[PDB]
From Swiss-Prot:
Protein name: Cutinase est2
Provenance organism: Thermobifida alba
Functional description taken from the UniProt entry: Catalyzes the hydrolysis of cutin, a polyester that forms the structure of plant cuticle. Shows esterase activity towards p-nitrophenol-linked aliphatic esters (pNP-aliphatic esters). Capable of degrading the plastic poly(ethylene terephthalate) (PET), the most abundant polyester plastic in the world. Can also depolymerize the synthetic polyesters poly(epsilon-caprolactone) (PCL), poly(butylene succinate-co-adipate) (PBSA), poly(butylene succinate) (PBS), and poly(lactic acid) (PLA).
Family: Belongs to the AB hydrolase superfamily.
Alphabetic keyword roster: Calcium, Disulfide bond, Hydrolase, Metal-binding, Periplasm, Secreted, Serine esterase, Signal
Chief localisation class: secreted
Enzyme class: hydrolase
Induction entry: Expression is not induced by the synthetic polyester poly(butylene succinate-co-adipate) (PBSA).
Residues that bind poly(ethylene terephthalate): 62, 133, 157
Taxonomic path: Bacteria, Bacillati, Actinomycetota, Actinomycetes, Streptosporangiales
Thermal dependence of catalysis: Optimum temperature is 50 degrees Celsius.
Keyword field contains Disulfide bond: yes
Highest taxon in the source lineage: Bacteria
Active site annotation, chain numbering: 132 (nucleophile), 178 (charge relay system), 210 (charge relay system)
TM region(s), chain numbering: none
Amino acid sequence: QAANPYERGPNPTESMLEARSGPFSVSEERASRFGADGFGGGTIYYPRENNTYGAIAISPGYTGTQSSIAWLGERIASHGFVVIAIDTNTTLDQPDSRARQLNAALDYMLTDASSAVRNRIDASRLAVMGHSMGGGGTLRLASQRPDLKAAIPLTPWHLNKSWRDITVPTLIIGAEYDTIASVTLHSKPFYNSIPSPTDKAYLELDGASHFAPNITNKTIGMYSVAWLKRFVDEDTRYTQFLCPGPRTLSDVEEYRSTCPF
């Protein structure tokens, strides 16, 4: 019973979570395509301050590259995380392949990145995220790695609709008007399959296209950071944003959750 050892940064506000950057200055290190084993390389964003933080790997979708998701890796790192935005071995790789590559990327941050990166990661506190087939890869990795602290699939796409074995806190973010990975066929079946007692939430962005996660988006930014803070840092200062959660007439079409977790 003491102050949370993983707490980082100032007491949070909605304004602070909606801003383009959080309170940590960030630096970047390349994971070379000519040096990354089992994935396509990427960029690691990390806080300049020398402390330890949770580590997160983020996968783009089909035809996508690290630039599709770079804004989000940078924004999340600026809240006190080490985050790799990956390129895949090929841009046509399937969701299960993206799952192995998110796994490789975690391993890369822990073993093969520079000293500066490795010294800033608490190796025991990891999470994964991903857009469309990358969000399918997130669900698969989450299923296979119950040691992970959180999973955030973003407009996910996967042909397997049943994720009943996931025990990792999962936030699925769907897009109301997604014409590629319709929430009817992908996000809602995925979320509906995860049973109690797993913590989870479903947040559907009102008005959003499939590509919302590829452009700076204050709703994805705020709620992705709140989720990673609550589950990767166990930072209960962030529960207030998640529970009862967004007003649902607004930028959120629907929000379901297992609050207060």
